[PDB]
Amino acid sequence: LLEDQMRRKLKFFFMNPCEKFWARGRKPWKLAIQILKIAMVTIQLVLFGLSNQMVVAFKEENTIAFKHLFLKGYMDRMDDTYAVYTQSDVYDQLIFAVNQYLQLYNVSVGNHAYENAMAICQHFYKRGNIYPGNDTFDIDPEIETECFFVEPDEKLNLTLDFHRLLTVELQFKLKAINLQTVRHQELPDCYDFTLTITFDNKAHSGRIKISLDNDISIRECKDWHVSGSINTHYMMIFDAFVILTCLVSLILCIRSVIRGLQLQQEFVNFFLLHYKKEVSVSDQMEFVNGWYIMIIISDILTIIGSILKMEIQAKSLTSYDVCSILLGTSTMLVWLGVIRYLGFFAKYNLLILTLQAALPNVIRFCCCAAMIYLGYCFCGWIVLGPYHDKFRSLNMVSECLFSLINGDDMFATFAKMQQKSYLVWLFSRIYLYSFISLFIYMILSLFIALITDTYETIKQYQQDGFPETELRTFIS
Amino acid sequence: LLEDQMRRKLKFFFMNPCEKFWARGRKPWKLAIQILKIAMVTIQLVLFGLSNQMVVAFKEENTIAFKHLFLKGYMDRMDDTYAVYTQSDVYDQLIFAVNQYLQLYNVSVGNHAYENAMAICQHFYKRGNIYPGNDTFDIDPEIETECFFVEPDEKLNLTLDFHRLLTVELQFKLKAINLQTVRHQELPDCYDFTLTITFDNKAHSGRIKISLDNDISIRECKDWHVSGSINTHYMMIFDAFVILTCLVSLILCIRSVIRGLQLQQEFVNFFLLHYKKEVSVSDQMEFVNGWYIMIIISDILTIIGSILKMEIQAKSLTSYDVCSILLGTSTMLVWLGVIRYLGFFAKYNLLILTLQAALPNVIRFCCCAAMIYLGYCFCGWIVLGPYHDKFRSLNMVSECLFSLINGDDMFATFAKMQQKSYLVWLFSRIYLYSFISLFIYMILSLFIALITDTYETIKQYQQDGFPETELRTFIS
Amino acid sequence: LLEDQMRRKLKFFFMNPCEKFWARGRKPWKLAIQILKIAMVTIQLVLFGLSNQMVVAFKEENTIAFKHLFLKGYMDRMDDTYAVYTQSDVYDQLIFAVNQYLQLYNVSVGNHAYENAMAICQHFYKRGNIYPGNDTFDIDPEIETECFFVEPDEKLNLTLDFHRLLTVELQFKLKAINLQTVRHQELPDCYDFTLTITFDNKAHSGRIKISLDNDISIRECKDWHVSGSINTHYMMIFDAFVILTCLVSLILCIRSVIRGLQLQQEFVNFFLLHYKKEVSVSDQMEFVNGWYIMIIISDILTIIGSILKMEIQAKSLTSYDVCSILLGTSTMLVWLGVIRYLGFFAKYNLLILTLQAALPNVIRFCCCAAMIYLGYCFCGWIVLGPYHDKFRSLNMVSECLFSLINGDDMFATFAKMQQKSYLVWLFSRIYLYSFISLFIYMILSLFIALITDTYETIKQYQQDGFPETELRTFIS
Amino acid sequence: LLEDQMRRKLKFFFMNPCEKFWARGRKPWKLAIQILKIAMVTIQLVLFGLSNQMVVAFKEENTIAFKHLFLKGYMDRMDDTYAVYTQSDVYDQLIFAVNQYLQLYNVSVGNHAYENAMAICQHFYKRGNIYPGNDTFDIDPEIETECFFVEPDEKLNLTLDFHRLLTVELQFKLKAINLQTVRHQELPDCYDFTLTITFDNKAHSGRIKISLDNDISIRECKDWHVSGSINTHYMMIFDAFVILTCLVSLILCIRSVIRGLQLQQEFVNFFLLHYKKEVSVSDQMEFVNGWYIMIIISDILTIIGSILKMEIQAKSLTSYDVCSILLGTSTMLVWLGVIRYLGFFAKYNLLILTLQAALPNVIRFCCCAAMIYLGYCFCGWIVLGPYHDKFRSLNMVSECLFSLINGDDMFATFAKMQQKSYLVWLFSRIYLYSFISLFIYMILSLFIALITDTYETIKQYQQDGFPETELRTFIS
């Protein structure tokens, strides 16, 4: 009858394990190709990560070197967020960095070279006058910028006036070859570094903020002869094969989803002819697999990210920002679908189901508590904002005070209070104590309670019955 | 009959959602105006916070500058809680700070200026004699204070004798204009800094404690001409409109509360004529909304805080202490009432109800455990007080050892024990180990147990019935 | 009958609240005097703590001063666990400390004085010969000690040979008066400091370990004249009244306990004549109050500690070690009995009862897990002991790795591995990962489960019935 | 009948406590010898640990000394992972270390001696040419190594060219005797230190990485005469007796296991003749003791580790790596079997049983969550890898981010983001926030729920019945 032929069709359709689709008929495809995509996208990613980590592992190191070469009185180990005050000493930095640039072949150990050359930038106001003692100023909302050009060879001349001075900057390129990357592996060895020292006077507070910033561009050498004999990049293959596995599993997943929707509306109609039951929300949403939706999102994202990787490796742009993010979130989604395949196995399916049933209420409670904690933020930002250093901008309030829910670096935040106004000090202790109490002895225990109860209910389900369903009646 | 006309009245009165008051009749007021107050009080606050954060962001920076200008041998990065020992070196600080004051136009990068000028304070005893080798002293409970006045222009003379010397102090004003605040935004640019270096000899221990303290006052410039053409503060509006929204929602909430109380005592009397039941505590407290009480507290507090903000911005006092606290706690209460509006929505009402039912027992247990932990405090303060540095005053004992319940910076407090008396060392390990065990493996699990059980009981309630109530009988 | 007259007697005896003993008859004694003892022993303790904290607050400060005076190249802020290597530099420390001693009236700011004077100690072997290049030595298990005496007034001579040198030491007394203690409060102002610099060569490793140690003795000044007119210690009273309140509550508690035991064996016999039931363990232990046992322990301990305080304050010894411990643990026990008084109140009695029922199983599980964790200790001590710095002696293994259960300073212990032998590195990661997993995802959840279940069972008890008891039958 | 004679046999076989095997018949062996093995293997281990800790306690100290002697500008306290930049300064290190080697008898306090002598290593390329400015290089995959030999006695000559220079190295031996070890205890006093300074130029980045590494070999002195009269190692005994106790308990445990297996298959057959039930998996695995399996593993491992200890102490090799690991994991297994003996006692058996029933599901969930967290790792490694310092290699990602589940050093990882690309910054906050939320408010609560429920189920079992078993029927 039409009824049992459904029972055959939808029971075998809905049988969770493709192990059962294996156990009648002969087909093993949909899991095999998807494990292929797992190992493919993860080897893709890991390979990407090691290459990019070599580029970075050279960049941070050279930036360290340049910091100790061009920054006067920079301790051989390190310093951080450097600062200057007296004017002649700013002059001594600038003169020092210049004389270090010109003599760098004598000075430096590293092989960095001029490229076949410096330059100097000053940004000053169109019209300065400021009389801080007379209570009278005029301000210009315009900056005129003047430059020099100082040559690699052939003591200095220069001019500076602080009051009109907004920022001073040094820009130039040092070009260096990375032995250990090209030598063993096939990656480009040529680096164009743009070094910029910059002095921020924008605060006009007396602090001249010094930073040495490093921009980096990759190039391949015109002639490389190693071992006395005559790089070759094969990634050109495996990126492509990734894009193909991804196109394929995308097509298949989408096809199965659409078939499931056609059988969705078909089933609705059939149940209308016979029993005239509707229930299109619950059962319509049952017919959605919901995991193949993840596999589609992941799969689109690996297509886009693999394409961007292929184009950036083609032009050698080296931003590697958007590409990396896409590739990483996609592979994380794949590794999350492995839980899917663990659902069939035997026992894990309980524990997975209860993670699945807890998440939709968990997010709800996250809304509720988000209002509390978002409330404290606007409190302590304004009350403690002038006094505490870790409450400064709202963001630091939120990310610090969230680190304080998890109970980390807490004695710090208690210990660093200014204690000038005694009232704000006391408030600080009521604020911090009360809040930490509220999150650690309520809200954490509310997640524990919520999830515990969810877990026992799905344990009862797997022990005795499941909620009555039109579909379940009619398949059995 | 009088009975059903109640059932109509009190059922519609008590219907939790104003969504239902919407669904019969036509009125949407009480929620609309209150969301207005939400966005109003939070934009009020956030705006306040960004302005005040600009003032502070300039203050801390200039204080850094002055610290590195007037403190001899203050490392360009920073030092902390500075100290001096040899007497000639105290002289070298003082002479140094003076010669740095007089030459500061040559020296400093910042634009700070004398105001159209120094002064020097010495606080010495009326009669000193102390013979620490003879075992004999006489002490004076009186301080005579002598000052100098040193001019901005035109090497030094001065006198100091340590034994009679209680504190030395330098006070003076540097006046500076903040470009980046006035320039983009409408806020005052003029700062009067009172710099005070102070040397605390009060301990008479040999340590001369140096600090450089910064007092700051805001003023508007007499003539500001920017861009070659001719600040204006609009906050004058939005503060007022806040005070109005607050007055309005205050009046409305109070009115509804009072009506609810009149229907309270009315209902009591009516149930006396008919069935003669009393139960005035349970049901009398039912008639209290209890959320509008929060909205009143919040609303009064935003009235007071907005008024203080308006007056301080009027006179430009800049304490911004009491005002900020009021405004922040008020807005935190508003953000806490958003949970109220989340109670109607659908499912959250469970989870909210169980937070509500857990809090009243949670506070009880907080009493009980507060006695334990308050007991340990008086223990470790005296036993470990001489030895540990973080147990010093009782307060540090309580705030450290509370940071130790949450399990932070613990290996520190174990590792820093003096270990001179071996008995106190051993006690230290029994103390710390035992206490940390007791709070993390009992009391945290007691909050978890308490709240879990509360949550399951209100889950049963929402599943099957609620406690029998006179009101509930008579509305249904 | 004999039966109901028991029911009268034992029901009123066992009625938990003395509120009920109040509600029939007229007596309020046993709680009133005990609250007296609460406030008495805690004011006793707190007063002790503030005085002792003044003594310490001066000691640590002066020790800081001396450290910066007598230790060459000791940064004005601080250094820690100082060290020396080259021999001429050890000489430069010693010569420096001497020339700093002799000139200290010129040098130092603090008022410390010679007392109406130095001395120098050298500890050398009876017979040294060590030939580390010849592989041959002879060792003497005897030390001969030679001293000098260097005068406060009137460049140096001295002799040192490192190989025979075990330790060098400088001992002497500086005598100083503390203004701020005597002046406001009644405490002695005279301090005898014994300063000892010591150089530990015991390791014979090339590191000469320098430390400056401070011994301190309190004395009262012979003539103190303050304000031009003519300390007085009243503690002589309040210590005594403490000892009296303690004797009194001790006598009363013991008396009630003994009466309870006489009615214990009486009841056993009476139930033998009538029903011939034994059950002497359960009910015999019921007749023990069990809280008055705490009050006795506390009370004895406050007697001993108050006596030791009175004697030490009499002789002014200032060890303040054993005394402090006794006084502090006693007062902690009192503050723990306040939970007792919270048991009667109303609702807390549930939560208290479940703490009481959980503790006896909690200790059991503590045994079980103590075997695991004590096992890991003997593992990581030997495997990681040479490599990690925080696993050194077993104790540091146990107190660090316990800090690691609570999840603190963890990334440190992962990050500091030597990584010389790769096998020990890998083992280190299996060790740390596995252990941290085991305690945080098992044993903490086992305490949570144990206590939760205990709490629900006593909740059922207070809801419906208690275990059948001979006593409970026969009182009702 | 054959049936009751089983019931006698298997009931007494399976009676958990050997207390019951005591209570009929007379034998106490199997527990007595095993407690012997407990105290034996733990005294073995602890003794090992104290000896090895003396060796290490001398090694780290001397390494400190040498670091401060041979490293120019190494602060007397310490520095870490030292670095150099300018070429003449590398020369100044090298010249300095040489002049410190030659003069070390004058210089150093420690007794270290030349052994009856330096050497110097340079590793340079076979053919260098690198033109970083011309974009052209040739690389040699070959290193030619040249050495000098510099004498202990009798300013320097040397040659260095950086571009061909891969590493420079100094190797030599200082020989020192440890007084405090031989003197009190019987251990060898002679140390051969191999000191190697090494300069890593491999990065060719401009950073010359300096390290001072210490290799150490133990020897016994040819002539030691102490106290004027004439070491002796007894460990030769107790190691052997350990190996014997271990052989014995191994033989016994294995014998009982094999007997249990023979009665296993016997019982299967007997139940086949009578009732013809199979159930060989459940009951076959019941007949395995499962604890004696642990005791065998432990016992084999103590045999191997004691043997390796005996051989290393024989030859005095001092690696002490594999040996230590074996000995430590074995003794940890023994200390874990003490839980076994706690199972019989009385009440602990519940709590033990539930640890035992929770572990097999716990590992399952560990698989599931391992997929998630292993997914995040491959995400944040690539996205945050260039920017964060603690995400560098994948391993640091995993061990840091695991330290972040437990909630430690979190505000660090939030605070150190580069913030160059704003998109990667934002992603960083979604990554970190989301992940920390997911593990602390889900997966920890899922372990809590899982274990709680397991605990209540075994509580019901011990209260009422156990699952029906063929064996249990037929023993009762």
Side-chain angles (χ1 to χ4, degrees), chain D residues 110-165:
Chain D
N111 44 301
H112 330 86
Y114 318 110
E115 185 169 359
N116 314 285
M118 188 197 258
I120 290 167
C121 296
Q122 184 188 356
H123 294 58
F124 47 84
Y125 277 16
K126 166 180 74 178
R127 293 182 183 174
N129 285 332
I130 298 176
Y131 297 148
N134 303 345
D135 278 331
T136 61
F137 62 80
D138 65 9
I139 289 176
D140 260 4
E142 169 168 345
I143 61 171
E144 190 71 8
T145 85
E146 167 198 359
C147 299
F148 287 58
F149 275 69
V150 177
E151 290 304 317
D153 61 356
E154 306 300 335
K155 167 150 180 297
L156 198 65
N157 163 41
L158 57 97
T159 312
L160 174 152
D161 298 337
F162 287 89
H163 283 77
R164 259 196 313 296
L165 177 63

Side-chain angles (χ1 to χ4, degrees), chain A residues 87 125 132 135 137-139 141 202 204-205 207 364 387 392 408-409 421 429 433 436 445, chain B residues 45 53 60-62 77 106 109 111 175 180 183 189 219 225 227 321 347 399 406 408 451 459:
Chain A
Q87 61 175 17
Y125 277 16
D135 278 331
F137 62 80
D138 65 9
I139 289 176
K202 311 189 181 70
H204 198 58
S205 68
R207 242 191 47 185
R364 295 171 170 163
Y387 294 56
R392 195 47 60 83
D408 180 85
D409 252 339
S421 300
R429 308 261 137 88
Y433 266 57
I436 283 169
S445 73
Chain B
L45 181 137
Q53 168 177 346
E60 191 163 357
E61 191 53 343
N62 278 0
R77 340 190 303 286
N106 299 338
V109 155
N111 44 301
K175 205 172 92 182
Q180 199 147 350
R183 224 171 56 220
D189 30 30
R219 317 179 313 103
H225 277 46
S227 316
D321 281 339
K347 300 209 107 142
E399 101 181 350
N406 281 359
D408 180 85
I451 271 178
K459 186 150 167 290

Side-chain angles (χ1 to χ4, degrees), chain A residues 142-317:
Chain A
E142 169 168 345
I143 61 171
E144 190 71 8
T145 85
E146 167 198 359
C147 299
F148 287 58
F149 275 69
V150 177
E151 290 304 317
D153 61 356
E154 306 300 335
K155 167 150 180 297
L156 198 65
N157 163 41
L158 57 97
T159 312
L160 174 152
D161 298 337
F162 287 89
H163 283 77
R164 259 196 313 296
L165 177 63
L166 178 90
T167 60
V168 174
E169 187 182 355
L170 323 169
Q171 318 184 349
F172 55 84
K173 312 189 127 100
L174 299 191
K175 205 172 92 182
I177 302 165
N178 178 335
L179 269 169
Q180 199 147 350
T181 59
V182 63
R183 224 171 56 220
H184 180 66
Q185 295 176 338
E186 323 307 310
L187 275 184
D189 30 30
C190 176
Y191 300 139
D192 204 43
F193 299 60
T194 307
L195 305 196
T196 76
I197 293 124
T198 179
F199 308 70
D200 282 341
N201 192 16
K202 311 189 181 70
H204 198 58
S205 68
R207 242 191 47 185
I208 297 295
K209 198 178 187 182
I210 288 171
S211 73
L212 188 147
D213 309 320
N214 213 337
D215 310 355
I216 180 166
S217 83
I218 294 169
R219 317 179 313 103
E220 320 189 19
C221 295
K222 269 170 282 272
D223 310 41
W224 92 98
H225 277 46
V226 174
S227 316
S229 70
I230 328 167
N231 287 119
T232 67
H233 46 59
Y234 63 89
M235 288 305 286
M236 311 294 295
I237 309 164
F238 177 80
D239 302 340
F241 282 74
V242 176
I243 308 165
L244 183 64
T245 66
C246 288
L247 271 176
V248 173
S249 178
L250 178 52
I251 294 167
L252 311 193
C253 297
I254 288 178
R255 202 176 73 91
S256 298
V257 148
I258 304 174
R259 293 166 53 190
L261 286 180
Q262 298 212 347
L263 272 75
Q264 151 167 324
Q265 293 166 332
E266 184 195 16
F267 175 89
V268 173
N269 311 144
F270 151 61
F271 219 97
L272 308 184
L273 299 193
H274 288 52
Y275 297 93
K276 183 178 179 180
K277 282 286 274 191
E278 315 315 333
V279 287
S280 54
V281 50
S282 176
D283 302 350
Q284 150 190 349
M285 283 327 298
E286 283 308 343
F287 281 115
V288 162
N289 200 221
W291 291 95
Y292 295 130
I293 303 309
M294 295 329 293
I295 293 306
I296 301 154
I297 299 174
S298 169
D299 209 352
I300 306 175
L301 267 160
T302 296
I303 284 167
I304 307 189
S306 63
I307 285 174
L308 261 160
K309 172 182 181 172
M310 196 58 220
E311 182 173 355
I312 281 167
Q313 176 161 347
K315 278 191 68 85
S316 174
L317 173 62

Side-chain angles (χ1 to χ4, degrees), chain C residues 87 125 132 135 137-139 141 202 204-205 207 364 387 392 408-409 421 429 433 436 445, chain D residues 45 53 60-62 77 106 109 111 175 180 183 189 219 225 227 321 347 399 406 408 451 459:
Chain C
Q87 61 175 17
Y125 277 16
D135 278 331
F137 62 80
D138 65 9
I139 289 176
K202 311 189 181 70
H204 198 58
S205 68
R207 242 191 47 185
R364 295 171 170 163
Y387 294 56
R392 195 47 60 83
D408 180 85
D409 252 339
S421 300
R429 307 261 137 88
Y433 266 57
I436 283 169
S445 73
Chain D
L45 181 137
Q53 168 177 346
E60 191 163 357
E61 191 53 343
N62 278 0
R77 340 190 303 286
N106 299 338
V109 155
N111 44 301
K175 205 172 92 182
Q180 199 147 350
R183 224 171 56 220
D189 30 30
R219 317 179 313 103
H225 277 46
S227 316
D321 281 339
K347 300 209 107 142
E399 101 181 350
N406 281 359
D408 180 85
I451 271 178
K459 186 150 167 290

Side-chain angles (χ1 to χ4, degrees), chain D residues 293-346:
Chain D
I293 303 309
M294 295 329 293
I295 293 306
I296 301 154
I297 299 174
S298 169
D299 209 352
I300 306 175
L301 267 160
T302 296
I303 284 167
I304 307 189
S306 63
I307 285 174
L308 261 160
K309 172 182 181 172
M310 196 58 220
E311 182 173 355
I312 281 167
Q313 176 161 347
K315 278 191 68 85
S316 175
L317 173 62
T318 189
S319 69
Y320 283 118
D321 281 339
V322 176
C323 183
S324 303
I325 306 182
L326 299 189
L327 195 68
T329 37
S330 60
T331 183
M332 153 160 83
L333 255 59
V334 175
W335 276 125
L336 177 60
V338 157
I339 288 194
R340 181 177 110 170
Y341 312 86
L342 282 186
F344 296 99
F345 202 90

